[PDB]
């Protein structure tokens, strides 16, 4: 019941929802803990977001980064937004990739394993 | 008169300053138009920023991205924050790399050429 470009994301894989944003787990996380933070409104380019949505997106991203870094035992974090076709954007919805990083750092999993991961992550936002 | 880790940045290379953030040009931009957006307060990790500083950092980053994409003739933008030593952070100050991207995309320059670039960029924020 969350849009992400032209697909519907099941709530089971969403671990945080705010008044303007939501965070979800990935089917193929690039690194363990690789999650996405998106505005609820499906806009394609970052400049399309209103200031309130910009503040919310990133304050949410900040909270999520802290949680995933902790949960997946990272010691740093990479935050990246591929804003546009020439930056590599595949899904036409603004979103931030949040990746826990460890020193010296296929991944495909079932919806059930994604849902289990989202359930673990929700605990940190209670 | 702007801190960036343990170095002072001359105003001549700063093209935007808000109540909580500032943007500057690079000595060796990775791509033309590669600029940095930083909070005025020198904190090392993204989780250290207050919510108001998070909102300001990214609303500023949004405005800067629009300007540099326009000025350097990009058609997209890459936004990246290397948050921590294991994410590649060299300067211990939170900052966002903003890079205009073009289809199919040493760079060292003098302070004067950096100052000329910052002066061009300020025009867009008048
Ligand atoms: O996903 C990472 C999680 O899995 C473990 O390695 C095994 O349970 C945990 O300590 C960590 O929280
Ligand atoms: O730095 C990019 C700037 O330089 C030019 O290529 C030459 O003046 C411009 O059109 C552009 O605004």
C-alpha closest to that of A52 among B96, B58, B124, B64: B58
Which region holds residue A33: left if phi is over 0, alpha if psi is between -120 and 50, else beta?
Answer: left
Q: Is B66 on the interface with A (CB under 8 A)?
A: yes
Report the b/e string of A76-108 with b at 16+ CB within 10 A: bbbbbbbbbebbebeeebbbbbbbbbeeeeeee
Coil, helix or strand at residue B17: strand
How far is C-alpha A119 from the geometric centre of its chain's CA atoms? 14
Cβ(A32) – ligand 1 distance below 6 Å = yes
Resolution (Å) of this entry: 1.9
- On whether the CB atoms of residues B63 and B25 are closer than 8 A, the answer is no
Return the bridge partners of A79, or none: A98, B81
Cα(A126) to ligand 1 centroid in Å equals: 19
Closest CA to B58 of B25, B94, B33: B94
Q: What is the CATH number that goes with domain B1-126? A: 3.30.428.10
Q: What number of residues does chain A have?
A: 126
Residue with CA nearest ligand 2 atom 3: B72
């Amino acid at each position: 019941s969350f849009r992400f470009g032209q697909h519907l994301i099941k709530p089971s894989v969403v671990f945080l929802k705010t008044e303007l944003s939501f965070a979800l787990v990935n089917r193929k996380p690039v690194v363990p803990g690789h999650v996405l933070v998106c505005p609820l409104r499906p806009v394609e380019r970052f400049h399309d977001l209103r200031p309130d949505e910009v503040a919310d997106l990133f304050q949410t991203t900040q909270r999520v980064g802290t949680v995933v870094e902790k949960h997946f035992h990272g010691t740093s974090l990479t935050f990246s937004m591929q804003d546009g076709p020439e930056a590599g954007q595949t899904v036409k919805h603004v979103h931030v990739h949040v990746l826990p990083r460890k020193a010296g750092d296929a991944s495909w999993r079932s919806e059930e394993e994604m849902a289990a991961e989202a359930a673990a992550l929700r605990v940190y936002f209670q």
